Assembly symmetry: C3
Homo-oligomer: 278 residues x 3
């Protein structure tokens, strides 16, 4: 059970985002069609961008489909400026039932943000779930609101976070303070790439390393700050990459699913303040 505080002037039903066990984090928003057969394109992109910026995570559920990747691409071009990759606009994320991770690849993704190692950082992730036929076990895409996590820290946790600084390598190198300001809108956020030799933490005594990681995890994975998404066919999800961190829940048996991801630039494009250019 929960209360419902939103009424839009748009032809949609809004309500708080809740995960499949009824948990309701301190961010996110569910949008559902206000007319039979409504397509996502019928809603004004400018309006979605606004909601995505303040709710940080939008779940549009039960809308009619983009027929293909080209259709999604054209939609995104109208939505904002697409951040192009060598493959174009759409990253295809297709998984088969029970397909092994060639024995070497890990079975979970820790929290991080897109564009860490890029010249420019995208503001939004746009995910279209093409197909998610069966119901899977684990493997949900996870999102955490870094402002929510910041409200959970106690005095000393926070004092520790503020001295801290991450150094990352994958070769490309990137460095960010753990506690950052939103690069356009000023509010306090976290930039943190979570480890599962390539992840160092400066500004603190290296014995406190364990404490930093344990506290950041406690806050970011807390029910107030953390949402795990169970994909459904034709979900359209829009995520605020500048405010959230994202990752993926561990899976034993992975199920069939097909996602498509487009990145949208900040307005105007955001130069990566964290990339090492020296």
């Amino acid at each position: 059970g929960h209360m419902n505080a939103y009424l839009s002037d748009q032809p949609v039903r809004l309500s708080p985002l809740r995960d499949e066990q009824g948990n309701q984090p301190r961010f996110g928003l569910l949008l559902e069609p206000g007319r039979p057969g409504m397509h996502v394109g019928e809603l004004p992109a400018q309006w979605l961008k606004g909601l995505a910026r303040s709710h940080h995570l939008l779940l549009l559920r039960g809308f009619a489909a983009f027929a293909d990747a080209e259709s999604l691409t054209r939609y995104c071009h109208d939505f904002g400026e697409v951040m192009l990759w060598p493959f174009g606009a759409v990253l295809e994320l297709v998984e088969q039932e029970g397909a092994e991770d060639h024995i070497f690849a890990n079975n979970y993704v820790p929290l991080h943000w897109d564009g860490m190692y890029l010249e420019t950082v995208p503001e939004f992730q746009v995910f279209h779930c093409v197909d998610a036929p069966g119901d899977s076990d684990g493997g949900r895409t996870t999102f955490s609101s870094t402002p929510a996590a910041l409200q959970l820290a106690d005095s000393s946790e926070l004092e520790l976070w503020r001295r801290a600084s991450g150094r990352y390598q994958r070769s490309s190198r990137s460095a960010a303070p753990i506690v950052e300001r939103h690069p356009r809108r000023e509010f306090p956020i976290l930039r943190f790439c979570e480890p599962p030799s390539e992840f160092h933490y400066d500004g603190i005594a290296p014995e406190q390393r364990g404490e930093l990681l344990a506290s950041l995890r406690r806050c970011l994975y807390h029910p107030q700050a953390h949402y795990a998404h169970r994909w459904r066919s034709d979900d359209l999800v829009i995520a605020d990459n500048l405010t959230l961190l994202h990752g993926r829940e561990a899976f034993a048996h992975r199920a069939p699913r097909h996602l498509r991801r487009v990145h949208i630039h900040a307005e105007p494009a955001l130069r990566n303040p964290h990339l090492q250019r020296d």
Copy 2:
């Protein structure tokens, strides 16, 4: 009787669009002043554009007037990019009580869209009703939501529509599939110019011509998809030309009325995908 689902954060009263016999189609929105003496200009244009894009037809009723055409013009310049004609921004549509259509001109206008034969197609029609003193009989401006009509088609009607293709001539020539995608936002729409020798329909066997026209008319003129507007002095109407088709109800005795119409470009201007340039 009907229910009222909208509360704005704007100083306006919103409610579902309903025609004068209480019918409530699956689109449209009535906006009314939230303060004594409110002028239409007090509402933010960007916000109206958003509503116009998702509700497709906005009726602003009971707001203070633009004093003249120049005032309307300046307003529209702020609203978006005006699509200029040789006469400028404002088409004057003035009718006198009982004035004959020189004996040759027809007394109704079938459904169609603006910019069929133009190099660029406008996104919005902005109508200001300068004056509509008496109450008339027939002659209402009609609008149809092509997505609504698409939800009404059965399996075979739809199968037929999807093969179909219109060829139009007035000399200028234009061709469009009957079932189209919105040229910016992807969702399914209809492009159809309705006949009352200059209207051919390809992709189907010419004996099915009768069936196409009868089914398209059944769906577009259905109460769920169709709205007929009784003009009142100082109505401001904003119509989504990319999604709707429009026309005019038959009249016996035409009454006095004065309308002004401005066209607003898509963002950016939309090149007519249907004009024959060969």
Copy 3:
């Protein structure tokens, strides 16, 4: 007591603006955080601009602070185009408890608008209250909605206002009709610089001068049209400079307060239609 008509699709609590004695003018809007620890930056600026344009005065109260002037500046750069002064973006308005106005400076500010004597006129004032520790006596920043005042005028007051015209000097000279149209959105507004030899009023017989001033004051200082703001620490106020006039209530004992003001250009920058260039 009062009724509450707003529900946002944004994570905020909206309600009508009311002064500290419970008066509720015909404009203004109070916005309050929808989440613990919310910062003003979490709300989309484009959305605030829209509300500021239709409600004319926004009071964001109880949000987390900009840490300093630089932070406020960066925020405003994202908000719109900052109108820069020789000092930069932020005017510092710091007052000390009981500090004398060097014996010569007046202890109240009559109603006027920003940019009277400038080449370009800003659309918005953005005020951040850095600190307002004690509770003061008098000295509140005042705002008046000129459309509200226009609804208060009777037939002859209005007839008089419409003939009237202000001529101002501080050297810089500026002239405006008392009754003006909004320079972008057309609706009727007032432009009036209120006197406490440098303020002349044309278009009327100079014996009617007294009547003009008395009627304009009656309407602009009327509870329906007038709001006086008691500053609190971290208030963020956004004012529609194109529609309102502003000033300051008389004070006996002035209290400690620190304000910061940024100006935001119209879109695009507005050339001052009233500056004498001849």
